[PDB]
Every structure is written in structure tokens, then in C-alpha cells.
């Protein structure tokens, strides 16, 4: 009994509720699992590449943004690539003007505003992609996750995408011991978190995991295929 | 698929908005024009038959666009006013460019371009006005032109637009001395046509707006026929049909 109200984003349901935003959430549940835990010194983004095509190189979840900011996308590729361009523009302008790396906690607010603007005007759709922002600045690592609802959260660990509730449960069960970890153990925890989403019949191969790390002295470096062998090896069986 | 937006092709090819635009024409006053060897006339039915009206000034459907060519309207009269203003402005613009009076086809096509632009990119009501053009130019001499809200047009030797158009055109096809008629022979023919397309009411000079165009002494003459000439033409046709018995 709400078919008239769930078509345009500028129409409140007679329950105090915008159905279009809630439908924009449902795009995030169509990507693929990706995990963004952090430690006291570093922040990592473990993502699972899409094995939906075959014989064709998988999509590119982790995206370089700046020397100290990296993102992981779990939504519409169009909106993801449209937001990453804006992010790059903001960081470039910040380094051009103030000659300082743009702090993560302000770039995220800029994202929030820019993604809120379409949520209110007619003839537009909310940005149907959820981000995972790993960054380092004067206050150490940060992990911010963005929703299509123009609502950004500050997270010590989060997973978004298909079946990400399993990863969230696992991280919630192991959040305490994340602050004190060397890079190896942090990446192993993230790999395990991504692993608890997959069906038990498949394991994390080197062709579908895309670790990307930033921290104190390490720039945001994306580790693609076989190069992720050092991180992935030593991972115990379930 | 249906009657909306003036920019939708029905699933059968027909622009329904324009087909409806060419429906209001079927209600306005009958207007016809006849081409003769030595001149052009443009007769029209003045359906403001109410007696309290004034200002018989030169026209109610017979406008003059420039020194050479004149116009007649049919349909939504306000859009007709807009179109006549645009025609006068276009004619003056061409005269400003080339310092010669505009050839009739030039102006007819210039207007039809606008009228078609309204049956395309838009969202606005197409002009529900069908016109008639009479004029002269050195390129082809006497010319007569028709137009539809669709933006289509064509040169006609003798035509009629408005109420009872079909019967008028049928009689004109069967009745025309094509290529070898003088002026007021065509005037008698036009009176016969209007006598065909009466209402119940028999016509009189209070219900007719004949106007004529003439090639004389190097200057073009558009004199709207006055009372006496029209009544005399009416008696003439009346006797002619009387002895036709």
C-alpha cells in the first residue's frame, strides 16, 4: 500500500520515510565483500574481486586516490568511478592550495555533502555505491565507510557488500586485539574476515583478493594478483 | 501512443496532436483563394455576424503582410494574430537584407519553418492556424499558397480552407477554367463557391470579405472590396443562377 510513494526520491512515504534511499542501500548488497579493519599504525582494505565473469580479469575494487587515502567500492561502478574522480580532484586541490595532505575526516564530510545534494532534488538518484576509505593523516589511521544515504560513519572495522554480515560478526568478535598488530597479523585478520563471507567450498585464491595498505610510513599501495602471495600465504584453513 | 505532448509518434505513425490541430481549422470561417491570369482574389467568410460589432476596418481575416503580398487566416484567431505579426516582421527583415520585396515562397517557407518547429522540439501547443497567401513577385508572377498547422504547404491554383472545405474544393476542381480565366470571372466563380458553402443563411455583403490583388502600372494594389461592389456581384450571380433555370 505504498506504490505511489516509492518512485521518486523527493516523495516522503506516509510513514516518514524515503523509500528511494532504502532502495539505494540495496545496491551495496549487490557488490562483493570487502573489509577495512585498522591497527594503531596502519589501515588496510581487503576486498574480494568479482568471479562472475570467467577468463576475463576481475574488476578493480581497490582504487588509488592519493598518497595517503585509498578507497574500496561496493556499489554501482558508475557512481563509484564518478565519486573517485571527485575525491582525486579534492585531494589535488588541497595539495595545490595549502600544500598539505587533505585530512581524511574532512574529505569524508565533503563526500557526505556531495552525495546528499542529489537525495533532495527531483530527477536525480542517490549515489548507489558504498565506499571504504582507508587513510592516514596527523591523527593516524582512519577507516570511514560511506552509504548511498549520504551518511558516513567512522569505523574501527567494517565490511560492506554481499554477505558482509558474516564478516561484521567476525570483526566484532575480534575487534579488541586489532590496535596492537604488526602489518602481517592485521592483513591476516582482514583476510580471515573476508574469508568468513565466502562459501566454505572455495578459498581465497591469489586471483580474487586485492589487499591495499596505508599507514605511518607506507604510502597507499595496492597489491594486485600474484604480488598478494606474501600476505595470503600462511593463512590457516577454516 | 496517444494524444499528448505534441512530440510523440503514435504506434501507427500519425502525429495525433497535429491531426487535432488540423481539426480546429474545420470549424473556422470558410476562406478560399483563386488564381487568375491578371490577378488574385482572396475571399473569406466573416463569421462575426453579430450586429453589435463595429470596426469593419479593412479586415477581420484579411491581413496585409507587405507592399506586395497579403494573407488570410482560419482557426484560433489569436495564434493567427501572432503568425501575421511574424510574417510582417520576416518580410521586413528580408527587405532590409536584399532591398527587394520578399518572394512569396521565401516568406511562406520561413513561416512554415516556425510552424513545424512547434510540431517538434517543444512541449508547447502547435499553432492551430491554417493560412492562405496571395502575392506577386518577379520570379513567377501571381502566386497562391496554403498552410496547415503541420508546417506543410503547397502552391495552389485555386483552393479553400475552413468550414465546408471538401465541397468547396470539389466544386472548384469540377468548376475551374484553369489557366485561362480573367479576374472577375474568378470573382463570379468565388461567389458561386461561397453560395455552395452557405449555412442556411443566404449570404450578403455583411457576411463576405472578398479582397483582390492586381498588377498595375508597376505598383501592386490590394483593395478590399467595399459594400456596393460586393452587393452588385451578388445580384449578378443571383440573376445568373436564376436564368440558369
Amino acid at each position: 500500500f505504498r506504490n505511489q510513494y516509492d518512485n521518486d526520491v523527493t516523495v516522503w512515504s506516509p510513514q516518514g520515510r524515503i523509500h528511494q534511499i532504502e532502495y539505494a542501500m540495496e545496491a551495496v548488497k549487490q557488490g562483493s565483500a570487502t573489509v577495512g579493519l585498522k591497527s594503531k599504525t596502519h589501515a588496510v582494505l581487503v576486498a574480494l574481486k568479482r568471479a562472475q565473469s570467467e577468463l576475463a580479469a576481475h574488476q578493480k575494487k581497490i582504487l588509488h586516490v592519493d598518497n595517503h587515502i585509498g578507497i574500496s567500492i561496493a556499489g554501482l561502478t558508475a557512481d563509484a568511478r564518478l565519486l573517485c574522480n571527485f575525491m582525486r580532484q579534492e585531494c589535488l586541490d588541497s595539495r595545490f592550495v595549502f600544500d598539505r595532505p587533505l585530512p581524511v575526516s574532512r574529505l569524508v564530510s565533503l563526500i557526505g555533502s556531495k552525495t546528499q545534494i542529489p537525495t533532495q532534488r527531483y530527477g536525480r538518484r542517490p549515489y548507489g555505491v558504498g565506499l571504504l576509505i582507508a587513510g592516514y593523516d596527523d591523527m593516524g589511521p582512519h577507516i570511514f565507510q560511506t552509504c548511498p544515504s549520504a551518511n558516513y560513519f567512522d569505523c574501527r572495522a567494517m565490511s560492506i557488500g554481499a554477505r558482509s554480515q558474516s564478516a561484521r560478526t567476525y570483526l566484532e568478535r575480534h575487534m579488541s586485539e586489532f590496535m596492537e598488530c604488526n602489518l602481517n597479523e592485521l592483513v591476516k585478520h582482514g583476510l580471515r574476515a573476508l574469508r568468513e563471507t565466502l562459501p566454505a567450498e572455495q578459498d581465497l585464491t591469489t586471483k580474487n583478493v586485492s589487499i591495499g595498505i596505508v599507514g605511518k610510513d607506507l604510502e597507499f599501495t595496492i597489491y594486485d594478483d600474484d604480488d598478494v602471495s606474501p600476505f595470503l600465504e600462511g593463512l590457516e584453513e577454516r | 501512443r496517444y494524444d499528448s505532448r505534441t512530440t510523440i509518434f503514435s504506434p501507427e505513425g500519425r502525429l495525433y496532436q497535429v491531426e487535432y490541430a488540423m481539426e480546429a481549422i474545420g470549424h473556422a470561417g470558410t476562406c478560399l483563394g483563386i488564381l487568375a491570369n491578371d490577378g488574385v482574389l482572396l475571399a473569406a467568410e466573416r463569421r462575426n455576424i453579430h450586429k453589435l460589432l463595429d470596426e469593419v476596418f479593412f479586415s477581420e481575416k484579411i491581413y496585409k503582410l507587405n507592399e506586395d503580398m497579403a494573407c488570410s487566416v482560419a482557426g484560433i484567431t489569436s495564434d493567427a494574430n501572432v503568425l501575421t505579426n511574424e510574417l510582417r516582421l520576416i518580410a521586413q527583415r528580408y527587405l532590409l537584407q536584399y532591398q527587394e520585396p520578399i518572394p512569396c515562397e521565401q516568406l511562406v517557407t520561413a513561416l512554415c519553418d516556425i510552424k513545424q518547429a512547434y510540431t517538434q522540439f517543444g512541449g508547447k501547443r502547435p499553432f492551430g492556424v491554417s493560412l492562405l497567401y496571395i502575392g506577386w513577385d518577379k520570379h513567377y508572377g501571381f502566386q497562391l499558397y496554403q498552410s496547415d498547422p503541420s508546417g506543410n504547404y503547397g502552391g495552389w491554383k485555386a483552393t479553400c480552407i475552413g468550414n465546408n472545405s471538401a465541397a468547396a474544393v470539389s466544386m472548384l476542381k469540377q468548376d475551374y477554367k484553369e489557366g485561362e480565366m480573367t479576374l472577375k470571372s474568378a470573382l463570379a466563380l468565388a461567389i458561386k463557391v461561397l453560395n455552395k458553402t452557405m449555412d442556411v443563411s443566404k449570404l450578403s455583403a455583411e457576411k463576405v470579405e472578398i479582397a483582390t490583388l492586381t498588377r498595375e502600372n508597376g505598383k501592386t494594389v490590394i483593395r478590399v472590396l467595399k459594400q456596393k461592389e460586393v452587393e452588385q456581384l451578388i445580384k449578378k450571380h443571383e440573376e445568373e443562377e436564376a436564368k440558369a433555370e
Binding site: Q4, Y5, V9, T10, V11, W12, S13, P14, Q15, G16, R17, I18, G112, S113, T115, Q116, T119, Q120, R121, Y122, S149, A150, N151, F153, D154, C155, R156, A157, M158, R168, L171, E172, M175 | -
Partner: protein, 239 residues
């Protein structure tokens, strides 16, 4: 019904429904109370911890819109944050044009008309949030104003917006807020928040305070922590 698909539509009985859904939208968000006392105004929200993974301080609802002006919101976080950003620009413009700080009563009228201006067009939709502006200055004492999604701006001694505004208002009516100081008011604020909170559905919230007034030299601030724990405790033994 049928007259509720756009803000530019009056119902046959004369009610713009697509602003009354917005005023009924804020009842989806958790409560937020702000009390005005002799020295200043103190806020407090039943901030929901959606999951334990979130940092202590994500989803803040106590934005600072200017040095001397606070803000506590309720409703859609995105739209409320956008309005907080808009108010941050009114204060800046007023300072740039007239040198001194923007009066609170003027700021609440600068923004309320903005929220209203989105409530009379078919293109845009009304804001789905309500918020309280708080401030203090020696010239004019402490002021508190509230803006519903409809754009109505009134000043309040005690205010409460959220899914349980009624219980919160009932409990606020039990204080002589005109005769108290922030030091003694924060304790009562925590008491109200725990009294009004419904635990059965909303475990794991995070009480979040802020005051501005005489005791902080008229500058908006999140409450220093030790005070937050003393208020947390005080609300606990009372419950």
C-alpha cells in the same frame, strides 16, 4: 490521499501532507533534549550505537555551527548535517558583513526560512529533520530555539525532539530550569535521558552531552569528559 505527492499541493481540508510526513519522519530518530538555565544551554542526545564496530564519536549529532552557537538534531542524519552546514554559512556571512557574532534569534530565523523555502516547491522535498540552536552571550543571556521541518521557529525553555518527545517533555516539566546552573542541570539532563530511553528495543546507546554558557565563556563545547562520567553515574544510581 492523492494530495500528498508534492509540497506544492494543498489537501482539500487545507493541509500540506508532504511536510507533515517530514514532521512525522523525525519520530524515526532517537530523542534529543536541550535545557536552558541561568548560565547557559546544555544539550544531550540518546545517540544510538548501531554496532560495536563504530568509533566512539561516529554519527555525531551535536554539531558546532559557530563559536557561540550549538546545534542538536533529530531525523535524517544526512539532511540534518546539511542544515548544520548551511547554518555554518549564515554565521560566517553575518560575521563577514557586520563584524560581530550573529545573534542566535537572528540565526534561527535565517535558517528556519530556508527549511521553509524547501517546503513550497514541487522540485525539491522538505528537510526531514528538526534541530535546536543554543547559545549564550552576556548581552542577551542564554537562548534556545527549535525548528521543525515545516519551518516554524520558536524559542523554548525546555525542548525535546525525537521518537519520545512526549515523555521527555513531561519529565523536563519537572525542573525549575530558570533557577539552576549548568553544573546542576547536566545531572538532570542525564536523568531525563535514561528515564525517557526505551531499553527493550535500543540497547547500546551512547549518551552525548554539550553545553555553552557562562561557565565556558560563551563558547560551544562538548562536555569535558569527567563531567560526562559523573552525570552517567548520577543517572545510574537514580535508576
Amino acid at each position: 490521499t492523492g494530495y500528498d505527492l508534492s509540497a506544492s499541493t494543498f489537501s482539500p481540508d487545507g493541509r500540506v501532507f508532504q511536510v507533515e510526513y517530514a514532521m512525522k519522519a523525525v519520530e524515526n530518530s532517537s530523542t534529543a533534549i536541550g535545557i536552558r538555565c541561568k548560565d547557559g544551554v546544555v544539550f544531550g542526545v540518546e545517540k544510538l550505537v548501531l554496532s560495536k564496530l563504530y568509533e566512539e564519536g561516529s554519527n555525531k549529532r551535536l554539531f558546532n555551527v559557530d563559536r557561540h552557537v550549538g546545534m542538536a538534531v533529530a531525523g535524517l542524519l544526512a539532511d540534518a548535517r546539511s542544515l548544520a552546514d548551511i547554518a555554518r554559512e549564515e554565521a560566517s556571512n553575518f560575521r563577514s558583513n557586520f563584524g560581530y557574532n550573529i545573534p542566535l534569534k537572528h540565526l534561527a530565523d535565517r535558517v528556519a526560512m530556508y527549511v521553509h523555502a524547501y517546503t513550497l516547491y514541487s522540485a525539491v522535498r522538505p528537510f526531514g529533520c528538526s534541530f535546536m540552536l543554543g547559545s549564550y552571550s552576556v548581552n542577551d543571556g542564554a537562548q534556545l530555539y527549535m525548528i521543525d521541518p515545516s519551518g516554524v521557529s520558536y524559542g523554548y525553555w525546555g525542548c525535546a525532539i525525537g521518537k519520545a518527545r512526549q515523555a521527555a517533555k513531561t519529565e523536563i516539566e519537572k525542573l525549575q530550569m530558570k533557577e539552576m546552573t549548568c553544573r546542576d542541570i547536566v545531572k538532570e539532563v542525564a536523568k531525563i535521558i535514561y528515564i525517557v530511553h526505551d531499553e527493550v528495543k535500543d540497547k547500546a546507546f551512547e549518551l552525548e552531552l554539550s553545553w555553552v554558557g557562562e561557565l565556558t565563556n560563551g563558547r560551544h563545547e562538548i562536555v569535558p569528559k569527567d563531567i560526562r562520567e559523573e552525570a552517567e553515574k548520577y543517572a545510574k544510581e537514580s535508576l
